[PDB]
Design a protein around this nucleic acid. Structure first.
Lengths: 111, 103, 124, 146, 148, 24
RNA sequence: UCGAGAGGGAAACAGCCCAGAGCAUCGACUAAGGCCCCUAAGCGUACGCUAAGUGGGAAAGGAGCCGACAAUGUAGCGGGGCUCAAGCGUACCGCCGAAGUCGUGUCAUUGCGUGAUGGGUAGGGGAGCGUCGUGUGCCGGGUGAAGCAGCCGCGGAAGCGAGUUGUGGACGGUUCACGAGUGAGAAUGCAGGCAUGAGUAGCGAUACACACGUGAG
RNA sequence: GGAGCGGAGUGAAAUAGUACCUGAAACCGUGUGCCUACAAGCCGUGGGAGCGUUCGUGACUGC
C-alpha cells in the first residue's frame, strides 16, 4: 500500500536532518508523529510536515483512511544543492561557508 | 579400481570413465585413442608396483576435447625505473576420457 | 583537427577499476590509487603463482612424512628405498594415497623397506 | 584433481598423557608441540588445527641438565619504566612448574591466531592426578625411529 | 603571445605555484602550444611523374575497355534528358567522366546537372578524376585535342 | 595542530555513529 | 656484483655466498645453506673433545677459564630450548632446498627440420593498439546511431566484439591511403565540483525580566 | 503558512516540470548476501572451510 511524499530543497543540513529521520524508521505512523512532536531538534518540524503528507496521500489518493495500520517503510534524506558564501576573517583572508540543503522522503505502507 | 598414469611429465589418478585434463597432445585429433604409461595400479588390496609388470600395462584413453584454460594476466614491474612488461597467457589443454585399464 | 581525449582515456580507466573491484577502502574507487595497487596485485600473483609449486611440495612432504612415520620409516629413507625399487611415483599422488587409501601407501612402504640396503650406514 | 584439504569433521582428536618424570624439559616441549600442532597424522594442513589434546602429569620433575636451574631466567616486562622482572628456574620450577612447561611449549608453536588455539589443548599439572579422567586419555610414550 | 592580456606576473613566499603569466599554456584560457598555423599543403611533383601517372590511369581504363568516344553529347538544343539517355546507352555504372572542350557549351550545360557525371577540359584532364570515374567519355574534338 | 592525513572512511564513520539523538 | 639484476641463503640487511627470471605447470634432480619445534628435511650411524650455555664477540697478561666493563626492556644464537648436544673435530649414509637444470606444453629473434637465443635503466631499431577528421568502395540506423552502465566471450600488449541487455533518442561501421590541437598520474600545474579536519573552533567586548497582543510558528 | 509533494491531466516520453536533451566520476544515502568485538593489518596475493540474494563474501594460514 506504499504511499509516499517528500519535501525537496528543505533548508536544513543533511546530517542534521538524518539525526531526526533515523528515529522514525519502522514505527507506527501515529507513534512516529508522537515522537517528532516531543523532539528537541529543530529539524523535527519539516520532517513531521512531510510525515503528514505521506499519511494524507495514503488516506486520499489510495483510500486507506485508517491511519493506524501504517508504519514507516522508507525514510531517507538526500543531499541537495549547496549554496556558497564567504566570511571575512583575520588579516584580510576569507573562508568559505556552505549552506547545505536536503531532500527528505518518507514512505508509509500498510502493515 | 584405479591406476596412476603419466601424461606429459605429470602424474594423475584415473579410474575407468574419468575425464582428465592433460597437456596438449598435438598429434591426436578429437576421437583418437592414446595409450598412457601406467605407474601404479590399485585394485582393492592388490597393489601392482613392479616396473617390469607395469611396463606392459598401458591405460587406454580417448581424446575428448581440445580446449584452452582460463586467461592469466602477467605483469613485470620494478619501481622508480619505469620498467613494465604486460603479457597474457592461455595454456592449451586436452581432455581425455579413460576407457580401459588392462589387468 | 582538435581531439577531445575523453572517449579514448576512459577505456583504460574502466579496465583498471574493474580489476580493482574488491579492494578495501580507497583502492577500489579512485583510478590513480587503484592503479598503483593492481600493479602490486599482478606482481604478487606472479611470485606466488610460481612459488606455490614449492608450497604444495612442502605440504606433500609433510603428509608423506607423517604417514611414513606411522609405519616406522622416516621420510629420509622411505624415499631412498623407493629410488632403489624404481617405483618412482610423484609426491603429488604419493601423498594422495596416505590420506585416502592407507593400505596402498602401507603396501608401498613395504616395498621401500625391502629395497633398502641391509645396513644403511656402511660405506657404499 | 586437487589435493585433499581437510574439512571440519575429518578430524578426530585424541587424548595423550605424557608423564614428564625426569624427562628433559626441551624434549617434552617438542614432543608436546608436535602432537598439539597435529603434525603427526596424514590429514595435516597448515591452516586447520588437527592436533590432539596433550595432558602433562609430573610437570614438576622435569630434568634440567647442567647449571640451567640457577642460570636461566624468565624475563617479563610490564610496560612501565623499570618494569622488567626475571625469575630463576630454581624458583620458577619450585612453585610454578606448570607455568614454565606451558611457556616452553608456547614458544615451540606459531605465534599467530591459530597457534594460540592449538595451545589451548595442553593441560599441565604438577601431581600424578589429572581431572580429565572422563576423556579416556591414552598414555603416550616418547620413542625414536630408525 | 597573442592571447589578450597576461602581461603581468600574477603574484610574487605565497605558498602557491610559480607563474609567469595568466595566459601560460597550462592555464585555462591560456595560449595553445604547438598549435596549428596557416600553411600551404601543395607539393612539387616532377612534371614527368605527373604525365606518366595520367598515362597509367588512362591506360588502365583502356585495358578494361572503359574509354568511349562520341561525336557529340546533344544535337541542337540543350537537354539534360538527351545527355541522360546517351550516357545510359554507354554505361550503367555509377561514376562517369566527360571530357569536352570548354567552347562546346551544349555538352557542358546538358550534362553538368547529371549527378554522376564529372566534366573536364581536354587540357585539364587529371589523374584524380580518371581514377574516380568508372568510364571516360571523350568528344571527338576533345579526343584529338588531347592526343595531339 | 593540523590533521596529518585524510581520515579513512572507516574511522570517520566510527565516530559519526556516536552523534545520534535519543528516542524520547 | 649493484648501478641496470628478479629468485634461494646470511632473522631483517642495493655491493657478501648460490644463481642470470620469454610464458604456463598441484612433476623430478640439485647449487649456496640446512635437516629437535617455530620451518621443508636426521632426536642420523661410529669414534674422540668441551662443563664454560664455550658454541652465542675481543687484547697484553695470569693460572676450555679469568682478563670482560653504560645508560627505554631479556637484548652479543632470529626465538623456544639445547651438554640424555639440538656444540666443535673426523669419516659414512640419506634427505630438504631457487624463477638453476631436466620433464611437458606454447610463443618470439636469429643462422643454416635443425643450432643458438629471448633480465634490463640511459639509449638505438622494428612491429602495432586507440581517438578525431578527409578521399574512396562496400554497408548499418525510430525494426532504435552516438554516448553511458552492466553481462558473456576474444587477443601476447596497447585493446576488441556487424555479441547481448538497460538507458538514450539521431547519427555510425569498415578496406586502402592521407592529416593530426592523436593518448597524463605527478610540473608546491590550471578551472569546476566534492571530501578530511567536524557537527569541531567561532558566533566580534557588562543586563535584561515579566504580563498581554499579533501570529501557522 | 508557503515551499514542496501524492493522485489527475498534456505530451511519443514528466527520474523531458521552466532547478528542465544525454546525465559519467569524485561525494552522500536506503535495502540487501557474506565477514567482522583475543586482534598488530603498503590493506594485496597463493592455499582454503563456511555461508548465500560460475558468481558474492572470506574464518584460518604462507608470502
Amino acid at each position: 500500500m506504499e504511499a509516499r511524499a517528500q519535501a525537496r530543497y528543505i533548508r536544513v543540513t543533511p546530517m542534521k536532518a538524518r539525526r531526526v529521520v533515523d528515529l522514525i524508521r519502522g514505527m507506527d505512523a501515529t507513534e512516529a508523529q508522537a515522537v517528532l512532536r516531543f523532539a528537541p531538534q529543530a529539524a523535527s518540524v519539516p520532517v513531521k510536515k512531510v510525515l503528514d503528507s505521506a499519511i494524507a496521500n495514503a488516506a486520499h489518493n489510495y483510500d486507506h483512511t485508517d491511519a493506524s495500520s501504517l508504519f514507516i517503510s522508507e525514510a531517507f534524506v538526500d543531499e541537495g544543492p549547496t549554496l556558497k558564501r564567504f566570511r571575512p576573517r583575520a588579516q584580510g583572508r576569507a573562508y568559505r561557508i556552505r549552506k547545505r540543503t536536503s531532500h527528505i522522503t518518507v514512505v508509509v505502507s500498510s502493515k | 579400481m584405479y591406476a596412476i598414469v603419466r601424461s606429459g611429465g605429470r602424474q594423475h589418478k584415473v579410474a575407468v570413465g574419468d575425464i582428465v585434463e592433460v597437456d596438449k597432445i598435438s598429434t591426436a585429433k578429437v576421437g583418437d585413442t592414446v595409450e598412457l604409461s601406467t605407474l601404479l595400479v590399485v585394485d582393492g588390496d592388490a597393489v601392482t608396483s613392479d616396473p617390469w609388470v607395469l611396463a606392459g600395462i598401458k591405460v587406454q584413453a580417448e581424446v575428448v576435447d581440445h580446449h584452452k584454460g582460463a586467461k592469466i594476466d602477467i605483469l613485470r614491474y620494478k619501481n622508480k625505473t619505469g620498467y613494465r612488461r604486460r603479457q597474457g597467457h592461455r595454456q592449451q589443454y586436452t581432455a581425455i576420457k579413460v576407457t580401459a585399464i588392462p589387468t | 583537427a582538435r581531439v577531445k581525449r575523453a572517449v579514448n582515456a576512459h577505456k583504460k580507466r574502466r579496465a583498471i577499476l574493474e580489476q580493482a573491484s574488491g579492494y578495501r577502502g580507497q583502492r577500489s574507487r579512485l583510478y590513480r590509487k587503484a592503479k598503483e595497487q593492481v600493479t602490486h596485485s599482478l606482481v604478487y600473483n606472479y611470485n606466488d603463482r610460481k612459488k606455490r609449486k614449492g608450497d604444495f611440495r612442502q605440504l606433500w612432504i609433510q603428509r608423506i612424512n607423517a604417514a611414513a612415520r606411522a609405519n616406522g620409516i622416516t621420510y629420509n629413507r622411505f624415499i631412498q628405498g623407493l629410488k632403489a625399487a624404481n617405483v618412482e611415483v610423484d609426491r603429488k599422488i604419493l601423498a594422495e594415497l596416505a590420506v585416502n587409501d592407507a593400505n596402498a601407501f602401507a603396501a608401498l612402504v613395504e616395498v621401500a623397506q625391502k629395497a633398502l640396503p641391509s645396513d644403511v650406514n656402511a660405506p657404499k | 584433481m586437487r589435493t585433499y584439504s581437510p574439512k571440519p569433521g575429518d578430524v578426530t582428536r585424541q587424548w595423550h598423557v605424557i608423564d614428564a618424570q625426569d624427562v628433559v624439559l626441551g624434549r617434552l616441549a617438542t614432543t608436546a608441540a608436535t602432537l598439539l600442532r597435529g603434525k603427526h597424522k596424514p590429514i595435516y594442513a597448515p591452516h586447520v588445527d588437527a592436533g590432539d589434546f596433550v595432558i602433562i602429569i609430573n610437570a614438576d620433575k622435569v630434568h634440567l641438565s647442567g647449571n640451567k636451574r640457577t642460570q636461566k631466567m624468565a624475563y617479563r616486562h610490564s610496560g612501565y619504566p623499570g618494569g622488567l622482572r626475571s625469575v630463576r628456574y630454581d624458583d620458577l620450577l619450585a612453585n610454578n612448574p606448570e607455568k614454565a612447561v606451558e611457556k616452553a611449549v608456547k614458544g615451540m608453536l606459531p605465534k599467530n591466531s591459530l597457534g594460540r588455539q592449538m595451545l589451548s589443548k595442553l593441560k599441565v599439572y604438577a601431581g600424578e592426578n589429572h581431572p580429565h579422567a572422563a576423556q579416556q586419555p591414552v598414555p603416550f610414550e616418547i620413542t625414536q625411529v630408525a | 603571445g597573442e592571447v589578450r592580456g597576461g602581461g603581468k606576473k600574477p603574484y610574487r613566499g605565497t605558498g602557491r605555484a610559480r607563474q609567469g603569466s595568466t595566459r601560460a599554456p597550462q592555464f585555462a584560457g591560456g595560449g595553445v602550444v604547438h598549435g596549428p598555423v596557416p600553411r600551404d599543403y601543395s607539393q612539387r611533383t616532377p612534371k614527368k611523374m605527373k604525365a606518366a601517372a595520367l598515362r597509367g590511369a588512362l591506360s588502365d581504363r583502356a585495358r578494361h575497355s572503359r574509354i568511349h568516344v562520341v561525336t557529340g553529347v546533344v544535337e541542337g538544343e540543350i537537354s539534360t534528358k538527351a545527355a541522360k539517355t546517351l550516357f545510359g546507352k554507354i554505361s550503367e555504372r555509377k561514376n562517369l567522366l566527360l571530357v569536352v572542350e570548354r567552347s562546346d557549351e551544349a555538352a557542358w550545360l546538358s550534362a553538368r546537372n547529371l549527378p554522376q557525371v564529372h566534366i573536364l577540359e581536354p587540357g585539364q584532364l587529371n589523374t584524380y578524376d580518371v581514377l574516380v570515374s568508372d568510364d571516360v567519355v571523350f568528344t571527338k574534338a576533345a579526343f584529338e585535342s588531347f592526343v595531339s | 595542530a593540523v590533521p596529518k592525513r585524510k581520515m579513512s572512511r572507516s574511522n570517520t564513520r566510527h565516530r559519526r555513529s556516536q552523534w545520534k539523538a535519543a528516542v524520547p
